[PDB]
Design a protein around this nucleic acid. Structure first.
Length: 1326
RNA sequence: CGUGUUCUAAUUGAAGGUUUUAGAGCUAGAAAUAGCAAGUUAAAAUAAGGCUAGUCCGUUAUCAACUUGAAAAAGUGGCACCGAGUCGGUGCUC
DNA sequence: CAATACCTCTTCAATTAGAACACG
DNA sequence: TTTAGGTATTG
């Protein structure tokens, strides 16, 4: 006899219960525990609050790197293990000397100086080649034997840091000269293509190629230099091939198939020889000489210096920086010493001001220091050569910095190599392990192998050929690369929705193709002159057309049929077909695809050879690495000429199908012995579509379908919710609103409700790359014409101006950067149809009027003028595809009268499928009762209401939400949902198919939906009581019920429950604090003392415990009892529950009282003294938990006084609410005490309270608008939760935290249940 | 069916930052102090650690009390009416 | 004690898989 | 992307 209302969302999950008349009842429950109170009555409003759920993203961000770090120590390890045999004969302790190169002189067992022992020996390494790099170039450039321990230190130095693999292949260090080689590419080219020869033309191909300008702008600066060249020509594409890029020369060769090549890409040499063969191979020695430029070119940016002298540059490059720093160290120093030397210390002495030593000593970056001296060199004339060096960023540079991620591992491996080639003769074990040595650095576990699971890994994909230990030397054999390979991509794949044991075949499987072809033709009628009833195509008819026509052609047309087949062989001169549009929508393209490569049409049509054709397509779709694809394809290679294989690896498939294979041809009908395939083939008289086969009771198919949906019997609700997609913060709230339900039933005597109403409410760095890319492709200089930063792109008027390339969107003209206020932002889609602020709908144009009629998207006038202007942007990606489709709606037809009544539908009908699972789980869990017939029983009506429904209901009905007065409102939003949702299905039972879960004309559909919530309106002229005609049911009165909302809304008491969750996360702050004299620091490792070695700091504890015991005080060691809080941290937490006392006593507590060990999780709530309540923040911290119930008269006021969004109400009513705001003008001062009283009662914010007042009592002369939202600013103090600093309009108020947990313990502590109705109360005295 | 955003989840890799230690600091002076030469680099750890010792795992998710269970989760608390500062009373059941 | 105030790893790169959502 | 709990520091 009741209706439960619910309001879910990201953080809040409000609820409310309604009496038949929409009243909410007052019920009296018991109260457990020891306090004098044995029963307390509370009103049924149901409420909850909770922490925003955590994603798994940032957890993956660590879970990854922890495998990245530990394996980075396995790398340097295999160096030692191989080295530990010859290392021993040159030093006994050098290998343990890095092992303990962290500890202090005290704890450090072995000699302090690592490389040579005695400091005098080891100073020389530090003072001859201090930079490590200086060492590495020497061990390549010198042929004179040196210390093995020096050799290893260079080998580990590149393995620890190996470099990026975004460019794979081999480099030959003979891009010694870029300029000269080019004459050996062109020269190689000029001979190849005499008809148009080409000129060096005095070009500098180094400076005009190695300069740091854009990837595109350099071939430009080259082609302009070169004579008579196109860019997209064969040679401008090869100038674009060496600089790493995607350049398409097909237009020159007029190849049918596009071919964009890259050297960095894996399929470059295969992509070449399967392109080179297509051309004559004259083109090879034009090509591998282009590679030479890229290999020569690529090294350039890292080093612009001549490399003829140095075999190794990057290692060489940074020696460049030392002296480029060394000179500019003395120079700058000297320049301060010949002028201005009264501030020498701060730059050099002090590391806290961004001074250089601070720049080196202090934790300051390359950016900040450079920022510091920008005046200093600009107020110093001593150095002007340098000021240039700074602006380019080249000065006294660091040798470990951020841009050194652009370095390829092929010079790290390139300098590792020669050292082995330098000193292997004298060290025989080097050559015998050089491959091993290079195989650690060269190796990389690909993404698809999976972590080498030992079977003990949760995330582990890969199986193995053998069980012995995987090493980078025996990796290839041990793993099953394919077996591993399949798992990586198999797991994601969608399962059959009809069959969950059969995995789904790719989109391009023939059999899926056979179904797509067979079925579509299934429903075809054909008429001639002399047939009385148009008949279906029969078993022989259907088979033949496919047999000759479809294999034969990629698309099958209609007038193919009249002439190709009926006329050819059925012999109708003319025929009338009604099944299909102008061409069959179904293509055996996959069938078409095969022939080009296989070249044996009669092999495809062979039945025995079709399982290969289904295992090869799956093999091709699955993978994406051609080198890898070869493996699975040698299984069949004995069948084919080898030239097929080279072309067979080429075409790669993407996209997987919905439908399981066995279903297509394996689900057999016992009575009449055909598969789904066989059925679509021949049907006597009538050929069923697929959807018919699976739903005709006369066919056993569906009876064998139902057998697949149940088996397993679903999964438990926790298993179930987690699986469904969407926000992690929505699913964690999806789960709680059902536990609340099971109790809401459990409260009202397990009598299921009559209705359930549930509604769900609905970036700084990408905004600088969506723009940077386009104005490279769009080609403009508008970005360089005016620089802007990503710190300014959260205001759209500066955001859209650059997305529009500094030009209007409707009139074709430049725009001013500064007065972006006169310009007016416009919506591609009117707001009235649907509310949207998205950039895909947002745009900036000079005036709103120009686009078109307001009632429609911009009109035919502008799509003409501009369609071309909105192409390149789509073309350069500045706009987006969805944004465009609506942008050009003028010519389409536009928003028809059935279109505008479609968004108006979407506004008030929840089309969102994640609040359709929240619908389904409800009905199924509530209604387990079955009619004798197949039909179900629904004694609980599920309802979906959309935000706008209640969102409007308030501004028009005298009820205005204020989110920052209280945290009762989130629950209030369920009452309104409960009623209006039940006020609707009680007055319009027609709508039970778009408002209730469970199974042109639009010129009044517009009128049906835009009108429906009007029976709450007295005038517009409507009766005060409206009742449904059909059942005679009365479902509204505007005298009684409208007040029974206000009284349920006026209420002072509402259940608000911050959900008690145990905190779990990282141990402490990630930063590493220095060795300090406090016990607060946590040992980063067990064996290191934070007082000697430093460590992590300040972990928070998962749930605080209440310990009472006696602790020894003073010399006496006498023990006197105390009761306090020990918050258990998440590092001791794992060792706490194991034995609590044996742990607890280790921290000092003796004589410990066992049964009174009270675990108190986060957000725990105690009640003490005169009705004040508190929330446990932590062991030290309390949050402020006492709601202040806004009186109704006060609550309304905030929306009007604030006047949010200026005025959005009928202007005839803009008057009526205006006198009120000045009528109850003193309501202002009626808030202050009411505001104040809460502060004195519970908050104990007295110390800062005196300060809010002085700001208000001296701000009474300014207007209401300024003031209104500002008295709203202050409610964060009254709010639930932690205290936060807030500011009155011209002043800011600091927060007052709750530092101690002494106060709480004396007072009674309450465990409340999941809703707030069942309790357990305790008085904490003893 | 095609197209593209948005987000969700798993695998493989780079570059910083940081924490001690190794970079023989010197000259006066008893001495806290003041004078000057130096600085860019390397080692190593990057959640404690765990046992199943794998080149594995170690931050998601789930959490009233209470009874009972290894974990899952099953089980426990009258009805109504009049009122309204966070539940107060009344009447009945009991 | 609790009133005052500074502090909290970041920036990239490459590959798969799925819904949920909106256009032709 | 700014919260909100740890932590040395000051009147």
């Amino acid at each position: 006899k009741y209706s439960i209302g619910l309001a879910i969302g990201t953080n809040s999950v409000g609820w409310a219960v309604i009496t038949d008349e929409y009243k909410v009842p007052s019920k009296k429950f018991k109260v457990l525990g020891n306090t004098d109170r044995h029963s307390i009555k509370k009103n049924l409003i149901g409420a909850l609050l909770f922490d925003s759920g955590e994603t798994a993203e940032a957890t993956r961000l660590k879970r990854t790197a922890r495998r990245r770090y530990t394996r980075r120590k396995n790398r340097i390890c295999y160096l030692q293990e191989i080295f530990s045999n010859e290392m021993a004969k040159v030093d006994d302790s050098f290998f343990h000397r890095l092992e303990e190169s962290f500890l202090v002189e005290e704890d450090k067992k072995h000699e302090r100086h690592p490389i040579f022992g005695n400091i005098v020996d080891e100073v020389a390494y530090h003072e001859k080649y201090p930079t490590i790099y200086h060492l590495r170039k020497k061990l390549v450039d010198s042929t004179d034997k040196a210390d093995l321990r020096l050799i290893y230190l260079a080998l580990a130095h590149m393995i620890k840091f190996r470099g990026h693999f975004l460019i794979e292949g081999d480099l030959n260090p003979d891009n010694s000269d870029v300029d000269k080689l080019f004459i050996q590419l062109v020269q190689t080219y000029n001979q190849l293509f005499e008809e148009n020869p080409i000129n060096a033309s005095g070009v500098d191909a180094k400076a005009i190629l190695s300069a740091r300008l854009s990837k595109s702008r350099r071939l430009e600066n080259l082609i302009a230099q070169l004579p008579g060249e196109k860019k997209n020509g064969l040679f401008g594409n090869l100038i674009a091939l060496s600089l790493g890029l995607t350049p398409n020369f097909k237009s020159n060769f007029d190849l049918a198939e596009d071919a964009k090549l890259q050297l960095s890409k894996d399929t470059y040499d295969d992509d070449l020889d399967n392109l080179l063969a297509q051309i004559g191979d004259q083109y090879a020695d034009l090509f591998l000489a282009a590679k030479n430029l890229s290999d020569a070119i690529l090294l350039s940016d890292i080093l612009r210096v001549n490399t003829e002298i140095t075999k190794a540059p990057l290692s060489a490059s940074m020696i460049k920086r030392y002296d480029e720093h060394h000179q500019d160290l003395t120079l700058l120093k000297a320049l301060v010493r010949q002028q201005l030397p009264e501030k020498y210390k701060e730059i050099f002495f002090d590391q806290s001001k961004n001074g250089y030593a601070g720049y080196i000593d202090g934790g300051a970056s390359q950016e900040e220091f450079y920022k510091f001296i920008k005046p200093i060199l600009e107020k110093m004339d001593g150095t002007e050569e340098l000021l240039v060096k700074l602006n380019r960023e080249d000065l006294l540079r660091k040798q470990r910095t951020f841009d050194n991620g652009s370095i390829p591992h092929q010079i790290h491996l390139g300098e590792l190599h020669a050292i082995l080639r330098r000193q292997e003769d004298f060290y025989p074990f080097l050559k015998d392990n050089r491959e091993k040595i290079e195989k650690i650095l060269t190796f990389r576990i690909p993404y698809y192998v999976g972590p080498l699971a030992r079977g003990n890994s949760r995330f582990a994909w890969m199986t193995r050929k053998s069980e012995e230990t995987i090493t980078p030397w025996n990796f290839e054999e041990v793993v099953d690369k394919g077996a591993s390979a399949q798992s990586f991509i198999e797991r994601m794949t969608n399962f059959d929705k009809n069959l969950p044991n059969e995995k789904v075949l790719p989109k391009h499987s023939l059999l899926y193709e056979y179904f797509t072809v067979y079925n579509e033709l299934t429903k075809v009628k054909y008429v001639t002159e002399g047939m009385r009833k148009p008949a279906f195509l029969s078993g022989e008819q259907k088979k033949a057309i496919v047999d000759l026509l479809f294999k034969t052609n990629r698309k099958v047309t209609v007038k193919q049929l009249k002439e190709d087949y009926f006329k050819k062989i059925e012999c109708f001169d003319s025929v009338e077909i009604s099944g299909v549009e102008d061409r069959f929508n179904a293509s055996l393209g996959t069938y078409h695809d095969l022939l080009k490569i296989i070249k044996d049409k009669d092999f495809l049509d062979n039945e025995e050879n079709e399982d290969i054709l289904e295992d090869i397509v799956l093999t091709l779709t699955l993978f994406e690495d051609r080198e890898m694809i070869e493996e699975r394809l040698k299984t069949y290679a004995h069948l084919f000429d080898d030239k097929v294989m080279k072309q067979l690896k080429r075409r790669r498939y993407t996209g997987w199908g919905r439908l399981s294979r066995k279903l297509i041809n394996g689900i057999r009908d016992k009575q009449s012995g055909k598969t789904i395939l066989d059925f679509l083939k021949s049907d006597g008289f009538a050929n069923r579509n697929f959807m018919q086969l699976i739903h005709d009771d006369s066919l056993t198919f569906k009876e064998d379908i139902q057998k697949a949906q149940v088996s397993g019997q679903g999964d438990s609700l926790h298993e179930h919710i987690a699986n469904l997609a969407g926000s992690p913060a929505i699913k964690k709230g999806i789960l709680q609103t059902v536990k609340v339900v099971d109790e809401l039933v459990k409260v009202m005597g397990r009598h299921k409700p009559e209705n359930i109403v549930i509604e769900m409410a609905r970036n700084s760095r990408e905004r600088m790359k969506r723009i940077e890319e386009g104005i490279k492709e769009l080609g403009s200089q508008i970005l360089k014409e005016h620089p802007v930063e990503n710190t300014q792109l959260q205001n759209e008027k500066l955001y859209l101006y650059y997305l529009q390339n500094g030009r209007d969107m409707y009139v074709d003209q430049e725009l001013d950067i500064n007065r972006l206020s006169d310009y007016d932002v416009d919506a591609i889609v009117p707001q009235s149809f649907l509310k949207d602020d998205s950039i895909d709908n947002k745009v900036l144009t000079r005036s709103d009027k120009n686009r078109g009629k307001s009632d429609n998207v911009p009109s035919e006038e502008v799509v003409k003028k501009m369609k071309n202007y909105w192409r390149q942007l789509l073309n350069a990606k500045l706009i987006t595809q969805r944004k465009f489709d609506n942008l050009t709606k003028a010519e389409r037809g536009g928003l028809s009268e059935l279109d505008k009544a479609g968004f108006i539908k979407r506004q008030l009908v929840e089309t969102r499928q994640i609040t359709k699972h929240v619908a389904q789980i409800l009905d199924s869990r509530m209604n387990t009762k079955y009619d004798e017939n197949d039909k179900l029983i629904r004694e609980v009506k599920v309802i979906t209401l959309k935000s706008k429904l209640v969102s409007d209901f308030r501004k028009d009905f005298q009820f205005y939400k204020v989110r920052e007065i209280n945290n009762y409102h989130h629950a209030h939003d369920a009452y309104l949902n409960a009623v209006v949702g039940t006020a609707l299905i009680k007055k319009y039972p027609k709508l039970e198919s778009e408002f209730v879960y469970g199974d042109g004309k639009a010129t009044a559909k517009y009128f049906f939906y835009s009108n429906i919530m009007n029976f709450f309106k007295t005038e517009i002229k409507r009766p005060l009581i409206e009742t449904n005609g059909e059942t005679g049911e009365i479902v509204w009165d505007k005298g009684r019920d409208f007040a029974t909302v206000r009284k349920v809304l006026s209420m002072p008491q509402v259940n608000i429950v911050k959900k008690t969750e145990v905190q779990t996360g990282g141990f402490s702050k990630e930063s590493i604090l220095p060795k300090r004299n406090s016990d607060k620091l946590i040992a980063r490792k067990k064996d290191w003392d934070p007082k000697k070695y430093g460590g992590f700091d300040s972990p928070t504890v998962a749930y605080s415990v209440l310990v009472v015991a006696k602790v020894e005080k003073g010399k006496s060691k006498k023990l006197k009892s105390v009761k306090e809080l020990l918050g258990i941290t998440i590092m001791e937490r794992s060792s706490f529950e194991k034995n609590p006392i044996d742990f607890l006593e280790a921290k000092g507590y003796k004589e410990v009282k066992k049964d009174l060990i009270i675990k108190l999780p986060k957000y725990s709530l105690f009640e003490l003294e005169n009705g004040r309540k508190r929330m446990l923040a932590s062991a030290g911290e309390l949050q402020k938990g006492n709601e202040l119930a806004l009186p109704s008269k006060y609550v309304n006021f905030l929306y009007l006084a604030s006047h949010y969004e200026k005025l959005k109400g009928s202007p005839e009513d803009n008057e009526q609410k205006q006198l009120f705001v000045e009528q109850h003008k003193h309501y202002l001062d009626e808030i202050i005490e009411q505001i104040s009283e809460f502060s004195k009662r519970v908050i104990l914010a007295d110390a800062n309270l005196d300060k809010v007042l002085s700001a208000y009592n001296k701000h009474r002369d300014k207007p209401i608008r300024e003031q209104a939202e500002n008295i709203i600013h202050l409610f964060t103090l009254t709010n639930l939760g932690a205290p936060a600093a807030f500011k009155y309009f011209d002043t800011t108020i600091d927060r007052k935290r709750y530092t101690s947990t002494k106060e709480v313990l004396d007072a009674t502590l309450i465990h409340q249940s999941i809703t707030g109705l069942y309790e357990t109360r305790i008085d904490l005295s003893q």
